[PDB]
Amino acid sequence: TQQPIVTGTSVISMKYDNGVIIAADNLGSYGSLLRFNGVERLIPVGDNTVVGISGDISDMQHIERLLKDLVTENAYDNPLADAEEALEPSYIFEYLATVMYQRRSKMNPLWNAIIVAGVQSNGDQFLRYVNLLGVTYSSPTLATGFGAHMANPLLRKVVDRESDIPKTTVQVAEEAIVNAMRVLYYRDARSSRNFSLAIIDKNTGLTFKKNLQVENMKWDFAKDIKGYGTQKI
Amino acid sequence: GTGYDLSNSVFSPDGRNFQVEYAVKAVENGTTSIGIKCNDGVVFAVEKLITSKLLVPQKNVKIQVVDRHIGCVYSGLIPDGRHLVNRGREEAASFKKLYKTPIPIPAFADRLGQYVQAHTLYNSVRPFGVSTIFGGVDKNG
Numbered sequence: 001t002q003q004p005i006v007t008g009t010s011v012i013s014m015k016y017d018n019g020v021i022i023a024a025d026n027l028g029s030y031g032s033l034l035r036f037n038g039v040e041r042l043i044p045v046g047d048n049t050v051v052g053i054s055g056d057i058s059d060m061q062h063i064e065r066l067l068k069d070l071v072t073e074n075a076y077d078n079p080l081a082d083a084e085e086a087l088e089p090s091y092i093f094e095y096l097a098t099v100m101y102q103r104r105s106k107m108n109p110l111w112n113a114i115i116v117a118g119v120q121s122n123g124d125q126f127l128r129y130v131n132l133l134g135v136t137y138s139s140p141t142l143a144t145g146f147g148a149h150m151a152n153p154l155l156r157k158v159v160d161r162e163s164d165i166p167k168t169t170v171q172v173a174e175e176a177i178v179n180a181m182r183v184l185y186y187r188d189a190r191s192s193r194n195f196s197l198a199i200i201d202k203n204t205g206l207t208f209k210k211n212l213q214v215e216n217m218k219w220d221f222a223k224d225i226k227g228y229g230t231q232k233i
Numbered sequence: 234g235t236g237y238d239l240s241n242s243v244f245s246p247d248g249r250n251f252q253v254e255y256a257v258k259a260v261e262n263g264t265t266s267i268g269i270k271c272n273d274g275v276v277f278a279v280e281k282l283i284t285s286k287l288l289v290p291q292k293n294v295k296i297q298v299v300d301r302h303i304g305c306v307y308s309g310l311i312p313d314g315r316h317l318v319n320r321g322r323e324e325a326a327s328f329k330k331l332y333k334t335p336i337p338i339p340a341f342a343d344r345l346g347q348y349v350q351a352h353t354l355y356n357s358v359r360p361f362g363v364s365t366i367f368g369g370v371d372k373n374g
Contacts, residue, residue: 069326072301076322079294 004056004111006030008041009190010147011052012180013117014155015125015140016173017166019201022052022117023177025185027192034192040210042196043067047206048118049089050198051096054144055112055132063096063110070095089118089126101134109133113144119202125165140165146188151180170199178212185214240356252360253353259362260309266295268306268366275368277306300325300335303369310362317361320348337371 007029013022028036041060043051045067053060070092075081093116103109109132118126129144130136140162141155158176159168177197185191193214199207226233237243238251245251266279279295297305297314299321307314324344328336336344345365352358 065330075298075301077294077297 001107002056002109002111004059006036006057007190008039008054008057008060009188010143010145010151010184011041011054011113011115012143012147012151012155012177012184013052013115013127013141014159014173014177015117015127015165016159016168016170018170018203019119019199020117020125020127021170021173021177021197021199022050022115023181023195023197024052024054025181025192025195027190027194028057029190032189034190037192037194040196042198042208044198044206044208045071045092046087048121048200049087049092049126050117050200050206050208051092052115052117052144053112054114056110059110059112063099063112063114066096066099067092084121086121088120089116090120092116092118093126093128093130097128097130097134097136100130100132104132104134115142115144117198118200123202125202146184146191147180150183150187154180154183170201174199181212182214182217186217241352241359242354242356250353256360256362257364260364263308263310263363264295266306266308266366268368270368274370275304277304277366277368279306299341299367300329302335302371303338303341303367305365305367307363307365309364313361314363314365317345317349317363317365321345321367324348335371338369339371341369342367 009025009027009029011022011024013020022042024041026037026039026041027034028039039057041053043053043064045051051067053063071087074087078085096114096116100110111132113131115129116126120126127142128136128138129142140159141152143151155176158172159165181195185193195212197209197212201207237245238255241252264280264282269276277296281293281295295306297318299305299318303325305318305321321341321344325336325341328340349361352360
């Protein structure tokens with residue numbers, strides 16, 4: 001039984017016709033103090049899987065070491081470690097899912113919400129969630145924390161049901177995800193303007209974009225708002 | 234007297250450890266393997282006897298990796314060799330976990346050394362029937 005201290009906020013993602021996209025801002029909050037700014041909360045494992053973590057940063061760092069070890073280990077006595085016997089997104093998830101539930105069951109959780117995104121060897125898109133309670137689920141779109149409330153309603157408009165995935169392109173998708181990242185910057189008091197985005201396309205592979213920024217923000221109307229009811233000037 | 238070669242930690246009258254020496258016999262009798270330290274790394278090579286046409290080619294791989302920067306190859310009792318590597322793997326993981334930096338080849342050497350030396354201290358264990366050639370690249374060469 002612990003309590004999160006340095007934290008990461010929302011992690012959002014969805015899947016398009018050829019793969020998946022996942023993003024998370026680069027902030028490391030410490031209460032209301034926006035203390036750290038070079039935090040990469042997107043962990044790529046191999047080149048067909050990206051793991052986005054939110055929640056307690058120290059635990060995230062720890063899940064990160066577990067992920068790197070999982071890779072180092074899979075290579076051992078594995079002549080096909082970079083081929084037929086390489087790490088699949090589904091293996092990586094199932095592993096974390098296990099670790100997460102075991103830790104909640106021991107009353108010493110890893111204070112996080114995780115989304116494993118990627119493309120399976122047979123092309124299939126992989127997107128699944130797991131949190132400090134060991135709870136898991138899937139959906140054409142997934143977000144943690146604040147993104148669950150604001151990002152999902154938006155992304156779901158792009159891919160509402162399964163039949164919508166094949167009709168969605170990377171442009172459409174990456175777009176919605178960037179717009180969502182903007183909305184979260186407007187209303188989440190624990191968010192940053194800078195974020196990282198990643199695309200795992202069954203054809204193009206893993207495209208990992210860093211240092212992005214929220215652009216095209218509407219603020220102009222802020223000038224026409226004076227007082228809180230009856231004031232005029 | 235005699236029989237100084239029946240128990241694994243016994244010193245013979247001239248100060249030797251016969252069980253260890255016999256272990257070497259197991260080694261000398263094994264496939265040949267080598268290591269060549271070049272100007273910015275090392276190369277490992279090994280002989281793989283085709284006991285029959287039934288062995289799948291390119292399969293039964295001998296050389297092993299410890300972590301991501303260490304290579305191992307040994308001669309003698311193969312099972313003994315894997316057991317040694319398995320211990321090196323944990324030995325390395327333990328080191329990296331606490332010091333963050335992947336384990337220096339020199340440090341790794343002594344980790345393996347202390348382990349093996351330990352199997353010549355008690356008569357309840359057998360010495361390793363393998364000689365191992367291993368190495369890699371680290372912070373300084």
